[PDB]
Amino acid sequence: LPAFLPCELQPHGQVDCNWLFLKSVPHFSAGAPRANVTSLSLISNRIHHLHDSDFVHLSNLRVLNLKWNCPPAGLSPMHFPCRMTIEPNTFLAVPTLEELNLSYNGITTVPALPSSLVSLSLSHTSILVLGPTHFTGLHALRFLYMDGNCYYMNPCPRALEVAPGALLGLGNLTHLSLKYNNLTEVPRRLPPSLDTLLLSYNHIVTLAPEDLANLTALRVLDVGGNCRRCDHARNPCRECPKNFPKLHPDTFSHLSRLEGLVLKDSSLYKLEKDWFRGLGRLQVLDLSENFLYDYITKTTIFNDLTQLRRLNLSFNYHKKVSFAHLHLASSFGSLVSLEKLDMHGIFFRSLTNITLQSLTRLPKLQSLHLQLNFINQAQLSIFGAFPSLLFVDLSDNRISSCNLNFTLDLSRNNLVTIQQEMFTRLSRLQCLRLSHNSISQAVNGSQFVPLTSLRVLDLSHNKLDLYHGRSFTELPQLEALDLSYNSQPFSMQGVGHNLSFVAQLPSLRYLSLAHNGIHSRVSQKLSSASLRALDFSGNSLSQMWAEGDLYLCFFKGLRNLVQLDLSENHLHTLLPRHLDNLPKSLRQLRLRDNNLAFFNWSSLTVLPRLEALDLAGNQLKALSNGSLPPGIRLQKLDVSSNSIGFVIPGFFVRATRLIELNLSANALKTVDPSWFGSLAGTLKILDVSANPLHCAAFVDFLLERQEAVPGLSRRVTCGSPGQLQGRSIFTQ
Amino acid sequence: LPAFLPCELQPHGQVDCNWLFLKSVPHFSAGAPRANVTSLSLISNRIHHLHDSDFVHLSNLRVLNLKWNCPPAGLSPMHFPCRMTIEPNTFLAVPTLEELNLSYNGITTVPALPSSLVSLSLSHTSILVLGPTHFTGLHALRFLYMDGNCYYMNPCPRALEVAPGALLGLGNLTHLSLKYNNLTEVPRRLPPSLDTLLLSYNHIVTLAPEDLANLTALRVLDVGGNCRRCDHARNPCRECPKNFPKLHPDTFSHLSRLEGLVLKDSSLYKLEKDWFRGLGRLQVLDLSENFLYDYITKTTIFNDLTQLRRLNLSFNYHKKVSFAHLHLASSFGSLVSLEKLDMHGIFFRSLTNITLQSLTRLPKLQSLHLQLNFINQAQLSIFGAFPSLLFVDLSDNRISGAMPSCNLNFTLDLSRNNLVTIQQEMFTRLSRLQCLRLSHNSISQAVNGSQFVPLTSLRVLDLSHNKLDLYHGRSFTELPQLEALDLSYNSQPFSMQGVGHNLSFVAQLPSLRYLSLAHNGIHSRVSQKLSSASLRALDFSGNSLSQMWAEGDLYLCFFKGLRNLVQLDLSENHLHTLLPRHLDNLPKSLRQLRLRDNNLAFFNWSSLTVLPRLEALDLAGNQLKALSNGSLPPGIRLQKLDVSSNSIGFVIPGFFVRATRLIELNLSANALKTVDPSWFGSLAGTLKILDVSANPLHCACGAAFVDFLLERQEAVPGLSRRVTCGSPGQLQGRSIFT
DNA sequence: TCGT
DNA sequence: TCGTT
DNA sequence: GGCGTT
DNA sequence: GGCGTT
Numbered sequence A: 001l002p003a004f005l006p007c008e009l010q011p012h013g014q015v016d017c018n019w020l021f022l023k024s025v026p027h028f029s030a031g032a033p034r035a036n037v038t039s040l041s042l043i044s045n046r047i048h049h050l051h052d053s054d055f056v057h058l059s060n061l062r063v064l065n066l067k068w069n070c071p072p073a074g075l076s077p078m079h080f081p082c083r084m085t086i087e088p089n090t091f092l093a094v095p096t097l098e099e100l101n102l103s104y105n106g107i108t109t110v111p112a113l114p115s116s117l118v119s120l121s122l123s124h125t126s127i128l129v130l131g132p133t134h135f136t137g138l139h140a141l142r143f144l145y146m147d148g149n150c151y152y153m154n155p156c157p158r159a160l161e162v163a164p165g166a167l168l169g170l171g172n173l174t175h176l177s178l179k180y181n182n183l184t185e186v187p188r189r190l191p192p193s194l195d196t197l198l199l200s201y202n203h204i205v206t207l208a209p210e211d212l213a214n215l216t217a218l219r220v221l222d223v224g225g226n227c228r229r230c231d232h233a234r235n236p237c238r239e240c241p242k243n244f245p246k247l248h249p250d251t252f253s254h255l256s257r258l259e260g261l262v263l264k265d266s267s268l269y270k271l272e273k274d275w276f277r278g279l280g281r282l283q284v285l286d287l288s289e290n291f292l293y294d295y296i297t298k299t300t301i302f303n304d305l306t307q308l309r310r311l312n313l314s315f316n317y318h319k320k321v322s323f324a325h326l327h328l329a330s331s332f333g334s335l336v337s338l339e340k341l342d343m344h345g346i347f348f349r350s351l352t353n354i355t356l357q358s359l360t361r362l363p364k365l366q367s368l369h370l371q372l373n374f375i376n377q378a379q380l381s382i383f384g385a386f387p388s389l390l391f392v393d394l395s396d397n398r399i400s401s402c403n404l405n406f407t408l409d410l411s412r413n414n415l416v417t418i419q420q421e422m423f424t425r426l427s428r429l430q431c432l433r434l435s436h437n438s439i440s441q442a443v444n445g446s447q448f449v450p451l452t453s454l455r456v457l458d459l460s461h462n463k464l465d466l467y468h469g470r471s472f473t474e475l476p477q478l479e480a481l482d483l484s485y486n487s488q489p490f491s492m493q494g495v496g497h498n499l500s501f502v503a504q505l506p507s508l509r510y511l512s513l514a515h516n517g518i519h520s521r522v523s524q525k526l527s528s529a530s531l532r533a534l535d536f537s538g539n540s541l542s543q544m545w546a547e548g549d550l551y552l553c554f555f556k557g558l559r560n561l562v563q564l565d566l567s568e569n570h571l572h573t574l575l576p577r578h579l580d581n582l583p584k585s586l587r588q589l590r591l592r593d594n595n596l597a598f599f600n601w602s603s604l605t606v607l608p609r610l611e612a613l614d615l616a617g618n619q620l621k622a623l624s625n626g627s628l629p630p631g632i633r634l635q636k637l638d639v640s641s642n643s644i645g646f647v648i649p650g651f652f653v654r655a656t657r658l659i660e661l662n663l664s665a666n667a668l669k670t671v672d673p674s675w676f677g678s679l680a681g682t683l684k685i686l687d688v689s690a691n692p693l694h695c696a697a698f699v700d701f702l703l704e705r706q707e708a709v710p711g712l713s714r715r716v717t718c719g720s721p722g723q724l725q726g727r728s729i730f731t732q
Numbered sequence B: 001l002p003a004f005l006p007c008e009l010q011p012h013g014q015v016d017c018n019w020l021f022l023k024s025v026p027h028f029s030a031g032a033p034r035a036n037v038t039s040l041s042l043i044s045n046r047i048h049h050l051h052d053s054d055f056v057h058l059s060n061l062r063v064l065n066l067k068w069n070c071p072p073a074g075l076s077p078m079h080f081p082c083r084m085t086i087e088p089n090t091f092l093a094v095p096t097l098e099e100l101n102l103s104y105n106g107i108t109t110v111p112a113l114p115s116s117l118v119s120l121s122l123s124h125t126s127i128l129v130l131g132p133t134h135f136t137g138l139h140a141l142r143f144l145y146m147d148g149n150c151y152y153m154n155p156c157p158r159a160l161e162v163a164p165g166a167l168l169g170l171g172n173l174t175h176l177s178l179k180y181n182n183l184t185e186v187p188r189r190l191p192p193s194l195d196t197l198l199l200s201y202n203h204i205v206t207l208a209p210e211d212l213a214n215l216t217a218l219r220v221l222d223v224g225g226n227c228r229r230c231d232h233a234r235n236p237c238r239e240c241p242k243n244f245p246k247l248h249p250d251t252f253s254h255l256s257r258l259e260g261l262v263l264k265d266s267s268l269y270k271l272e273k274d275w276f277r278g279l280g281r282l283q284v285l286d287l288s289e290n291f292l293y294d295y296i297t298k299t300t301i302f303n304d305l306t307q308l309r310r311l312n313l314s315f316n317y318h319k320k321v322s323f324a325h326l327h328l329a330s331s332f333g334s335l336v337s338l339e340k341l342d343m344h345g346i347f348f349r350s351l352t353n354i355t356l357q358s359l360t361r362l363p364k365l366q367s368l369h370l371q372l373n374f375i376n377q378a379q380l381s382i383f384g385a386f387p388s389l390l391f392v393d394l395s396d397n398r399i400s401g402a403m404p405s406c407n408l409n410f411t412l413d414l415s416r417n418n419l420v421t422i423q424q425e426m427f428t429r430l431s432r433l434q435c436l437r438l439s440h441n442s443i444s445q446a447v448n449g450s451q452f453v454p455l456t457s458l459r460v461l462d463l464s465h466n467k468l469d470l471y472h473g474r475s476f477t478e479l480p481q482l483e484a485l486d487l488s489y490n491s492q493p494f495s496m497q498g499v500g501h502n503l504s505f506v507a508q509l510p511s512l513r514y515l516s517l518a519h520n521g522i523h524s525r526v527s528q529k530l531s532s533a534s535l536r537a538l539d540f541s542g543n544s545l546s547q548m549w550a551e552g553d554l555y556l557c558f559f560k561g562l563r564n565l566v567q568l569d570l571s572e573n574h575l576h577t578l579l580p581r582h583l584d585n586l587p588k589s590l591r592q593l594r595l596r597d598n599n600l601a602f603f604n605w606s607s608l609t610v611l612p613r614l615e616a617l618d619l620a621g622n623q624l625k626a627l628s629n630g631s632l633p634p635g636i637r638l639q640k641l642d643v644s645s646n647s648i649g650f651v652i653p654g655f656f657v658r659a660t661r662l663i664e665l666n667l668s669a670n671a672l673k674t675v676d677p678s679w680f681g682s683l684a685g686t687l688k689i690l691d692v693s694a695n696p697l698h699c700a701c702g703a704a705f706v707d708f709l710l711e712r713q714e715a716v717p718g719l720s721r722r723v724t725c726g727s728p729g730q731l732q733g734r735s736i737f738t
Numbered sequence C: 001t002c003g004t
Numbered sequence D: 001t002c003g004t005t
Numbered sequence E, F: 001g002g003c004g005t006t
């Protein structure tokens, strides 16, 4: 048997008891190797009471997760109140414990904890008071999280109280988080060891040097969202009061090690120069959701922030307005360490050579985020002069892998016809995203002429008219072309289309024609020497193959094709005819979510290199009508989510090379070894879950091959008899 | 028991044996009232052999459908060959038989048939020869169908042979259809009684008066697709040979009663005036898929077609080209009986005052079809001057500038065009317009009340599948009569993370009754409260009310202000939970609530008390495991309850009892093991629909539920075939009456 | 099947 | 939450 | 106490 | 003879 039923043993002594609806902590059998357990996860069970005996026998337990077990009223889906009781020696009985998560539990005080504890989450609990006695002897504690104990989702009448010097005994505390606690001031006398202090979304409306006293090791400080602009809030929000916030000039001046500072959503119309005196080595500055729209056009403060790597200016928009132009201050020219600049959501209508003048010669600038700005005029040629750009986001505007390569995102804009003069000075560009535009154009080879280095072009969710024979031929390096969800042209009854351009793309490897509703009046034969993968899912190959033999050889000419996706093609039948005229190079064939109630298994002989077959989500009633044929090179077979009620003995036997097999979500009543014969030893994945198994033969088979059966402990389920229906096969 | 198991008795003596996989015709029990059967449907069974005994006891059988029983190789899904044998007195033993369908069966000759036969389908069979002997004594036969016996889907080596005068003995034959038979000429000496003759998609490449000799009663004639233009074909197609077709001037001149004539796909570059001489009654003329693009600009032939009601000129396009303009001949102003003119697929780029000049004064013209033309400039103001237009189709074009039925009202379809911003000057002179379709365009615009100003009579506006920015407070306020507004599938703006939206315009539309905000993905940063005095129905399906209701109490009263709302659709809203909170703050006027395809695994049934006027509740496609946790509450006025496609495994006794007014109940596609009368109590007599199909019912010997379902059999749909066993195996997936 |  | 205040 | 994959 | 809602 598996050792820790009803939970699952994972590698490295990791026990998973998540989502088992347990009312108390399982102590397991004494025959189980309890000392081997280093991690115990009990996420989202119904344990409302913990006891001295619950973890004592787990001699080497290091991580313990009791999250979501007894959620407070506001966080409960049904608003059920919950109070969790904990006996005094519950966690003291585990002197090896290093990581404890008690979040989303209705506890009202901190329990007694062992001196070994390194990490502690008390977030989203009912603890309203922290004090000196609560953290006695916890000298190893590095991380303390207690977010969300007083806000709209987990309310309290007043606020979280952190007693002065309550945490001061925690000598090794580096990370402290106290967000969403209704705090009106920074807690007094925090540990000097802190490098990360997070106080965001409280109402700390004034600051001063004494509020951050003796915190000279501080590397990251988040005091953002403490007096907010609720015109931008998606959640409940109190408006920043008039004449606030009030930050004393010298508030941050003693924080010499500070790398990151978050001042987002603090209703700031300007910055004080004094705040950043002594923060010359600041690397990250978040100024998002403020009112700095005018400040950034004229400020001189970036001359003193020369080490800055990331600068977030996003959603610094003026209420009720967008600007005609937005010209950045000259001082941005001094940010020579700058790698990432976020300018999304400022709202401005024109992007010109003046806009980003100051940034043009910054030697290390890689990312530039200009999305969601209502830009309707964009001079795209400006980006050619930049020395180091890898990513420009101009998505979600009104203009009319690709990791580590120069990529331009123009998705979700109002482009209707592409003109080549758009792309002048962008010959270095390797990836271009034009998805979710409105491009309806008989594209013909004169649209992308300047893009001589382009390897990836995403034109999904457009209305492109595939007709002219030289489409995309002006892109010599083009390797990947996404033309999915351009269905509207293919729904024009009586107006046909031409896909002969595919043959003229000499280095194309990936093509998607997915979800186009291709059903009639189209080229009879696709061809390509280069193409490796074609996604043709979400079309009507059914209708096409019903038009006599017009489309019998539609894929034939893709003579080096390795992957073909024919999922969601309304296919009720699939003949030897059709499979024989697929390219003989084919290794992976996907046929998910078709209408196949029958499949001639002997016809798989015609696909000599087929390794992976996906028939998931069809309506097969059985695995019979001839077995899998001899000499087949098949490795993966997915027949899950069918209605398979029985399997002929010796069905899988002849598939020597078979490795993965998914029989899940079927109508199987048993799991018989005669189906696989010799394959039972060779198989590495045998999914048999979500089947109505008759629980009274199969248990000894599954236990013998238990390493190959995923979710054996919990997911492999009985269908009969009642009393065991829907429950694990090991409940008896 | 139901009388004709395993088939179903329907009203009017109609027995349905379709799709039962029967290898022979069922004779039924002798206790069954065999004489009551007037219609027997056996569609798509596996009956390859018919016998003298099969229908003899059906003394009053009038209709018999044996379609798809033994499909020929080409029509078989797996290309299995099939030959159907028929004993001599199979149909003679039914002397009352009037309607016989033998289509999609591999028969090679016509069987012996009773003299009572009125209608006969031999379409898609293996009959390659019709002859004099085949129709002996069939004097009552009015309809003969035999389409598709020689073409790509049902091939023969040569063609269907119709012997001269083979059908001449059929004295009452009115309708004859012989499409897709590879015929090279009209069959000789057809019956003079014919009013409808259909010969489309053969290869009758020449015609003459003698080909249609003595057919003076002919009302409809289809000779279209007989020499085709395969550049437009979606199916296998042979090109019209050079110098063809060859129609003699006087071919149709003796057909005085002809109302409809189909000359589509005949590769005609012009018409002959002589063809229409003596066609004084001609009401319908189909000229589609020809090469008449130049002919229609200058022809004078429409001066002699003054009785014509429908004229189809669609797909008269010039190969490889579209035209800059298209100016119709002056003679179109002469078609004074014309009601419908179809001009889709000609391909022309500009629509002006000149284009349709000739049509402007035609007094009865209702429909004008200009779709699929690649038009990029359209002067829409021209349509105001027309006296009788009800429908103008300008859909699927390239135009970019200057729900109630709409069937009997002036409607303009501009859907599937390239409009990005709407300018009011588009709609000048269209103040009479009552319905406007702008769906599947690319409209991305902060619409604000200055876009539709001329449309003073507009009641219905479809803006679905666009990218409209709902923000300004006066959107659509310039439409005073606006009753129905579809803003569904405008989701992209609502996916702009951090850019919020404003739906306060809904309150400013004083006569709005229907609104759709469906499939918009509305999830955050939106107006907290919708309001309207007038609104009756709101489709809010396909959004994330789940996310909205998870933001504290911001959207707690989101629907509250719709104070006269009768229908609310909250389907596909990702709702895992549904509290008393949320239902209490819906409008108390609400009568129909739809919650299909949400994520509801639990439902507090007692909270239905808070919706006092609720009559229809749709919870189909959720994940309810049982009907329990309190029963339906007392005084509930509920009439329809749909909890189908859940995982309901049991029902607490007395669950439905308190719902006095309950009429329809859908429990189908669940995990129910029985059907217990204690669930309903007194309701069992009251219920009019009780769907219990696709449930894994436990069919034990003397199972409780069979006597309950039989007692209430009029209320249970698909009882004969669809009500199914789940256990034990050997009965699994089969009928409860096996 | 979209200015040959 | 998009030329206001 | 029930609810739910956050 | 089997397949399949045409």
Ligand SMILES: *[C@@H]1O[C@H](CO)[C@@H](O)[C@H](O)[C@H]1NC(C)=O
Pocket (backbone or CB within 6 Å): A150, A151, A152, A154, A155, A156, A157, A158, A159, A182
């Ligand atoms: C937070 O503090 C305010 C002001 O003292 C108080 O009114 C409110 O009740 C407190 N709690 C919450 C959950 O907002």
Ligand SMILES: *[C@@H]1O[C@H](CO)[C@@H](O)[C@H](O)[C@H]1NC(C)=O
Pocket (backbone or CB within 6 Å): A353, A354
């Ligand atoms: C920006 O582009 C314009 C138009 O080509 C040009 O006149 C101007 O010199 C360019 N540079 C600057 C710094 O304005």
Ligand SMILES: *[C@@H]1O[C@H](CO)[C@@H](O)[C@H](O)[C@H]1NC(C)=O
Pocket (backbone or CB within 6 Å): A444, A445, A446, A470
């Ligand atoms: C695309 O169309 C334009 C306009 O007709 C033409 O000038 C151009 O040569 C075409 N491009 C190609 C590559 O044929």
Ligand SMILES: *[C@@H]1O[C@H](CO)[C@@H](O)[C@H](O)[C@H]1NC(C)=O
Pocket (backbone or CB within 6 Å): A468, A469, A498, A499, A500, A523
């Ligand atoms: C598709 O285009 C190519 C080249 O433009 C042409 O040779 C081919 O015949 C076209 N297809 C059809 C169906 O006309």
Ligand SMILES: *[C@@H]1O[C@H](CO)[C@@H](O)[C@H](O)[C@H]1NC(C)=O
Pocket (backbone or CB within 6 Å): A576, A600, A602, A603, A606, B078
């Ligand atoms: C099954 O496939 C084999 C081999 O391709 C072929 O001989 C046979 O005709 C097929 N049978 C059916 C029923 O389709």
Ligand SMILES: *[C@@H]1O[C@H](CO)[C@@H](O)[C@H](O)[C@H]1NC(C)=O
Pocket (backbone or CB within 6 Å): B150, B151, B152, B155, B156, B157, B158, B159, B182
């Ligand atoms: C139709 O007849 C032609 C010529 O008489 C012949 O070539 C062909 O075999 C027939 N076509 C079909 C589809 O039966």
Ligand SMILES: *[C@@H]1O[C@H](CO)[C@@H](O)[C@H](O)[C@H]1NC(C)=O
Pocket (backbone or CB within 6 Å): B404, B405, B406, B408, B409, B434, B435, B459, B460
């Ligand atoms: C259409 O007209 C009919 C009768 O004239 C009327 O019943 C109906 O209300 C009208 N519908 C619209 C949407 O204008």
Ligand SMILES: *[C@@H]1O[C@H](CO)[C@@H](O)[C@H](O)[C@H]1NC(C)=O
Pocket (backbone or CB within 6 Å): B448, B449, B450, B474
């Ligand atoms: C709508 O917006 C346009 C452009 O900003 C403006 O001209 C017009 O006055 C606005 N309409 C109304 C009704 O205010």
Ligand SMILES: *[C@@H]1O[C@H](CO)[C@@H](O)[C@H](O)[C@H]1NC(C)=O
Pocket (backbone or CB within 6 Å): B472, B473, B502, B503, B504, B526, B527
């Ligand atoms: C929506 O617009 C109305 C009037 O234009 C305004 O009163 C209301 O505050 C707006 N909604 C939001 C969320 O600002």
Ligand SMILES: *[C@@H]1O[C@H](CO)[C@@H](O)[C@H](O)[C@H]1NC(C)=O
Pocket (backbone or CB within 6 Å): B620, B644, B645, B666, B668, B669, B689, B691, B717
């Ligand atoms: C009950 O629901 C099913 C789908 O779940 C549907 O097929 C059926 O039509 C419904 N019953 C009635 C009587 O309409």
